[PDB]
Amino acid sequence: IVCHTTATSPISAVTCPPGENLCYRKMWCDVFCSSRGKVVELGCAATCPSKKPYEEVTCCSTDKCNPHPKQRP
């Protein structure tokens, strides 16, 4: 699978590992949140990460499918 990963500067596309089939999106909060909205971690995962109390977490199984709120897939 090809996912966006945020480990990279600038943000770009990577082919996930073997077994890590899903692309995900994670968003929690800094308290820069007010000032610069929401911190985003994009990447790959084997199973969709269960996580946290406060999220805007999203899985997908398509190529392309976890972009930052940058633009559209």
Partner 1 sequence: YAQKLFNDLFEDYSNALRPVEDTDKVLNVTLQITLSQIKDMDERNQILTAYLWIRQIWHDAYLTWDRDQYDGLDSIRIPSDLVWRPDIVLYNKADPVNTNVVLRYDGLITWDAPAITKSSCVVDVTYFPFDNQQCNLTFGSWTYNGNQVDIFNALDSGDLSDFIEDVEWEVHGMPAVKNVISYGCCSEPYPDVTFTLLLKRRS
Site string for partner 1, 42-61 (x = CB under 8 A): x-------------------
CB atoms inside a 10 Å sphere around CB 70: 9
> Which of residues 11 and 59 has its CB atom nearest to partner 1 in the complex?
11
CB atoms inside a 10 Å sphere around CB 25: 22
Q: Where are the alpha helices (DSSP H) in the chain?
A: none
Q: Would you say 59 and 30 are in contact if contact means Cβ atoms under 8 Å apart?
A: no
Q: Is there binding between residue 41 and partner 1 (CB under 8 A)?
A: yes
- At its nearest, how many Å lie between partner 1 and the CB of residue 31? 10
List residues near partner 1 by CB under 8 A: 6, 8-11, 27, 30, 32, 35-42, 68-69
